[PDB]
Design a protein around this nucleic acid. Sequence first.
RNA 1: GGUAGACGCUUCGGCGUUUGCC
Length: 672
Amino acid sequence: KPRNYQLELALPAMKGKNTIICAPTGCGKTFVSLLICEHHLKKFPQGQKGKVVFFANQIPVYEQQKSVFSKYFERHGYRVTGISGATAENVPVEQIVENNDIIILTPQILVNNLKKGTIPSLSIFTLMIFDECHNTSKQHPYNMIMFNYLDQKLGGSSGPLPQVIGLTASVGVGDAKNTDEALDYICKLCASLDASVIATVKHNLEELEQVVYKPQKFFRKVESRISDKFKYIIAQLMRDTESLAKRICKDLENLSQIQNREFGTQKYEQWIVTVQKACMVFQMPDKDEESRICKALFLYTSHLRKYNDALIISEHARMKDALDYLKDFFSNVRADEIEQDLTQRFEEKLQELESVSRDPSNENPKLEDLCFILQEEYHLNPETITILFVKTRALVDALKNWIEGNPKLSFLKPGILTGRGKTNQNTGMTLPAQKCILDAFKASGDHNILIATSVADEGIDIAQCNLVILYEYVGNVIKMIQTRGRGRARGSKCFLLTSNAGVIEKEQINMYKEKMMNDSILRLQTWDEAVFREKILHIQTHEKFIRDSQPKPVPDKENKKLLCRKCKALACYTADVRVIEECHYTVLGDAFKECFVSRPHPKPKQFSSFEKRAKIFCARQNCSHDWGIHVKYKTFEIPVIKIESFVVEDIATGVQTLYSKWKDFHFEKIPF
RNA sequence: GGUAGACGCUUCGGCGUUUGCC
Ligand SMILES: [Zn+2]
């Protein structure tokens, strides 16, 4: 049965108004979506019918809502379907939309069909439901859909527009400093969704509270480790590696605009990257010492990265975790004359590092305050379900081994949850491997605590956790309100454990931003709905004028060279390059086939017309630098290269340029 | 292969991390 606060949220939508529904995570917005959609489809007379589209930002939420809407409306005589990236190609989308009454969609599927013209205008729909509507922002596919909606509303083109409904737990305030700034960000968000009403729970607040409780937050400010015998060693290997680069490249300190860099910092990381992109554009006339000097500096900068990474891992986890990170790196580097030198310089101090990592007196004080908290809660409630958010995927693996390798935590049964990772790198965690652990992360399951990276807005619902711990982890006001839904029962707790005062302070800001987020909405609801619809109209118009008044570059028909970024080897020319569907780039000619090898692809996914088959690398002198992928297009199998892997050398001028995207590289682009 | 968001850094063009979508 529907609750009274669920009916209260659906009331403005059931009255036909474009409504943003702001409610706490876990209060059952999905039921509210059904209540609105069940009312929308029954109000039409016999000679008419309605069509609803539901937008989902992730495949798990896509399959979830597709199954919920299917089993709720099938008996009532409505057809539900869905179009995701898997079933989007070679299918008549226009027929699928017309032959079904409810279509759960991924927003990119609609954005691509509006451009292709297969879906001419949004008039085909009578109701659009945006899940996590706060994402209707700068360039998200939600806003691109609303740009199509607004251009038809403001232009002279008539045609019935669909009702727009948005669900979120927080509309946000942006970078607002006071209530007036917060009120304008909310109004501009309502203008992006054409919303006339913000539906919140006001009359049944007592019922909503007895269903979703607010976890009490605890800020735990700690101190960093005092003496770092691990850093004194690793900082020496970096100074050693910094010197070996100097012998090859004089005045290396002038290669970056970053001064006074320090080991184990984000500023050093920006520095070790700036120099890396500068050593690739070196032009030696020998063209063989070029492949020697550049490749040598690329290895030094690559090794200096893992050292700087380990120094950060040491500051947030055990010295042993930063040790095993480097051990895996050199074990990956092995199986070159320069790599063997940097390995011997490391293997020398390896035994000394292990005698420092094993020293029980060099314990991380932050992990001892995390151990104290875990010991306390599981001593009070031994059936505690805990989820621990960390910043990097290396920190997930670090705290997992730390929990499994601590006798004081033998009561813990830790699990892992990371993102899917990059599509062309054997990293991350596949979707079945994700769902296989979230089914094991229960009070009756195998695992007692989950260590996770950041998660999408609300995502699939996992077991309620009476303990949530944020380890050096801070976010915006929206994410703060969504992590409350991790535990909704009475007695849920949330710990923010960090050694940085700016992290504690950012959460205090977010708490004040939420106050401004509510008080702005509270007084926004006290306006005449006609005045509100008119205020957003000039916003809708002024945001369109700016968009309508915002650059087609002139290409460079001069042929260029494409060299490997690591060994400077000639791979192909721009004359051999053909473009596919204005997005993807391949190489012709039989000379390019002699320059790359192929490993089987770790994630053989599929996009517009491509079947991933292999990854391609450089082959000259065993460079193995990633160049792209080898896919199977409609007819044949071809390589697909990324310009990020290469350096563009000009033939006559001899200049070497670095391009990060193909759109920023202008040359003769022949269709394939 | 192409891309979207969030967070941090920025010497304001980007860099890194992280999570996604086609
Ligand atoms: Zn190479």
